[PDB]
């Protein structure tokens, strides 16, 4: 069963249009091995992937509008450290079995607590520390964050200006 002990979860309150720029700021400060960014649709996913490839960031997109074999091929290319950022609308469950993953951006809000858990929680073998950052845009974000805190008994504090380096990286 997926657990949440060993993951740091924050939130940032902003608009909907500023979620791109703000994201870049994070990728300009936070040190990471591989970053998985979750969106809600395929159009926004392809737009974000193209916007990241327009930058020097190597980004690969795995959305729900793909064949299963293509999804597996792209996920295997991403597992071999061939590309850093993975813009995924969803996964195949089982948490996140990729040990190299450090940061997880909830660019959009998931459906319910099971979705937030499958997005945040991991199922690795050696890597127990990691960071998860969810963007807050309206009151629904705060309500679902409170629901997550009530269901999983976790803490979702506000993101400060400085983060400890060894707190989420072993």
């Amino acid at each position: 069963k997926l657990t949440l002990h060993g993951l740091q979860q924050y939130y940032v309150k902003l608009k909907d249009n500023e979620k791109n720029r703000k994201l870049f700021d994070l990728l300009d400060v936070l040190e990471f091995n591989q970053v998985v960014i979750f969106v809600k649709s395929v159009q926004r996913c392809i737009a974000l992937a193209q916007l990241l490839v327009e930058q020097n960031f190597p980004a690969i997109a795995i959305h729900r509008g793909m064949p299963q074999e293509e999804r597996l091929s792209r996920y295997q290319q991403f597992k071999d450290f061939q590309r850093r950022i993975l813009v995924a609308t969803n996964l195949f469950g089982r948490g996140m079995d990729i040990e190299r993953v450090n940061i997880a951006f909830n660019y959009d809000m998931p459906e319910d607590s099971d979705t937030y858990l499958h997005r945040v929680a991991r199922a690795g073998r050696f890597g127990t520390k990691g960071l998860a950052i969810t963007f807050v845009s309206d009151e629904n974000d705060a309500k679902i964050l409170n629901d997550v805190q009530d269901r999983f008994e976790v803490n979702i504090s506000e993101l400060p200006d400085e983060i400890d380096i060894s707190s989420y990286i072993e």
């Binding site: 040190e31 190597p58 450290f81 190299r100 990286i169």
Partner: protein, 589 residues
């Protein structure tokens, strides 16, 4: 008014932490006047004078005008024209240098004032580097020479290395400096590297800006590159290294030891570094191993990652590993046996030495042992580094006793000490094998003292003593030396397994059955017949020895012959069994 100058210098320092005087100076250096120029430059902040472009250009013009004769005579590059400087006509001139002494006094006095502002004139950088290289390769190939060498090492650390840190991306000025740097011993080179890493970037606000920019660009391309695109990204790191190798390599080493992946992309992107940058990368590896936990009941992951990076980067690129072995030997002298790990990796990665089943075990008991080159150039560098600095015997004799020091001096949990002793013993065995392989009877017999000297003087146990002495032999005096039946003691500890029981024809015919293959099979059969004759001849001399060989009669034999031998290594275990059974059988019960 000389005070607004101090205020503006304070401003320059502070903003980075977050004129008739100079008009005279430029016109006072323009004719001949050096003494009054010194008097003017001393009455202001340290580098406020040469911080401007005009004053630095005037000082450099004066310097090369005074230095012209020495350079024209002993420093012009082969196959150039050169620009005669037409020395100045004043009688108050600084008396142009002629041979390495007037240079010393006047030119070093006038170089002290420049600092990291030689970058305005790269022509003087080259002239001074060439003069230094000529002086080194001439004189060092002596009190005055020692003083000149010290002054040259000071001029380097003060002017040359900081000025090389402000040139944007000079891959040629980093390969011109290493024309002179390849003549210093590695201790002076490491001094200069440590000083211009830890001290020059603190002062000199321009150097602080350069450090900030280099760390920024290093953070940029590191989190960004791929496993896919290596060397569209090796070029960026190459340029950053041409600029500031110390900072760049320190940051990327931190990243390597932190993430423990992305180590192969990095040891692959380090393809466009200059030789000076390889020398600086070696020092950064050493420093990252030395300065910084570290136990956590099991050897830490960061040390394993550093060791893997070191093995890879020393196997791939020519990096002149001399400080690494001396550092490992010093750590052993200090009583710490963890860095032996990385040493193992080196000997394991750039020599192809690398549990085993009975098939390969019998094969390891002379072509089958080499079977089980791509490591004919790296092993050459390893052997050269071992022979030049005389580090084979010291390292072996250090491990031989440090294996006891690990367990008894506690240098816990009873599971960490076991693995550490195991690692030390295995590294000793592997290094002794490498030496016996590649330092042949010539270097071996000459640089390995006899057992009469080892156990008596260099406090070494009998096991490692005989392990190192065996290749020299390939008796009564040796026995009396070892005890201080003695003949039995020497006979047992001298004979290996290879000269007691012959294999190999099966696997030989399997692998052979192809002109090269046929030639290899013929050579292997020749070796097999030679070993047959070897075993026959060895068993021949055994009879008369058995005649005069010899309760607790076997108990002394049992412990001090069987136990260390059988415990030492698996081949030694099979030998210890075969010996007793075959020879001692033909008291056994």
């Amino acid at each position: 008014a000389d005070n607004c100058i101090m205020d503006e210098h304070k401003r320059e320092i502070a903003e980075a932490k977050q004129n008739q005087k100079l008009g005279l100076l430029e016109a006072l250096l323009k004719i001949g006047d050096w003494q009054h120029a010194q008097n003017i430059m001393d009455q202001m902040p340290p580098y406020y004078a040469a911080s401007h472009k005009l004053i630095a250009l005037a000082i450099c013009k004066l310097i090369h005008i005074t230095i012209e004769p020495l350079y024209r005579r002993v420093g012009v590059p082969k196959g150039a024209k050169g620009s005669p400087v037409n020395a100045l006509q004043n009688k108050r001139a600084p008396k142009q240098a002629e041979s390495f002494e007037d240079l010393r006094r006047d030119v070093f006095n006038m170089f002290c004032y420049l600092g990291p502002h030689l970058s305005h004139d790269p022509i003087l950088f080259a002239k001074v580097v060439r003069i230094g290289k000529s002086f080194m390769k001439e004189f060092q190939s002596k009190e005055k020479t020692e003083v000149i060498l010290s002054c040259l090492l000071s001029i380097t650390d003060q002017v040359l290395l900081p000025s090389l840190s402000l040139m944007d991306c000079n891959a040629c000025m980093s390969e011109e400096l290493w024309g002179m740097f390849k003549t210093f011993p590695y201790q002076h080179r490491y001094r200069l590297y440590g000083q211009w890493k830890n001290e020059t970037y603190n002062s000199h606000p321009l150097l602080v800006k350069v450090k900030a920019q280099t760390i920024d660009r290093a953070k940029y391309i590191m989190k960004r590159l791929t496993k896919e695109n290596v060397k569209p990204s090796g070029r960026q790191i190459g340029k950053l290294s041409h600029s500031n190798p110390t900072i760049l390599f320190d940051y990327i080493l931190s990243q390597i030891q932190k993430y423990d992946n992305l180590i192969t992309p990095v040891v692959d992107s380090l393809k466009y570094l200059t030789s000076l940058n390889y020398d600086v990368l070696a020092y950064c590896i050493i420093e990252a191993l030395a300065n910084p936990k570290h136990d956590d009941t099991t050897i830490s992951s960061w040390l394993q990652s550093l060791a893997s990076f070191c093995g890879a980067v020393f196997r791939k690129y020519p990096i002149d590993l001399a400080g690494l072995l001396q550092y490992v030997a010093n750590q052993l002298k200090a009583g710490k046996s963890f860095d032996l790990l990385i040493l193992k990796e080196v000997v394991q990665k750039m020599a192809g030495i690398e549990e085993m089943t009975m098939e390969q075990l019998e094969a390891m008991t002379e072509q089958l042992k080499a079977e089980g080159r791509n490591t004919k150039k790296s092993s050459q560098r390893l052997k050269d580094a071992l022979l030049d600095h005389d580090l084979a015997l010291p390292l072996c004799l250090l491990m031989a006793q440090q294996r006891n020091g690990v367990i008894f001096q506690e240098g816990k949990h009873l599971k960490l000490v076991g693995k550490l002793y195991d690692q030390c013993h295995d590294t000793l065995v592997q290094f002794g094998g490498f030496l016996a392989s590649n330092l042949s009877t010539e270097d071996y017999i000459k640089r390995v003292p006899s057992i009469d000297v080892l156990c008596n003087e260099f406090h070494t146990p009998h096991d490692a003593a005989f392990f190192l002495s065996r290749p020299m032999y390939a008796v009564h005096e040796a026995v009396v030396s070892l005890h201080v039946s003695p003949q039995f003691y020497a006979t047992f500890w001298s004979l290996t397994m290879y000269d007691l029981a012959v294999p190999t024809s099966y696997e030989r015919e399997v692998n052979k059955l192809k002109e090269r293959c046929t030639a290899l099979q013929d050579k292997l059969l020749e070796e097999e017949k030679k070993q047959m004759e070897h075993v026959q001849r060895v068993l021949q001399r055994l009879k008369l020895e058995k005649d005069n060989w010899l309760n607790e009669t076997i108990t002394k034999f049992l412990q001090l012959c069987i136990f260390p031998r059988c415990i030492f290594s698996a081949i030694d275990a099979v030998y210890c069994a075969r010996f007793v059974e075959l020879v001692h059988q033909q008291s056994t019960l």
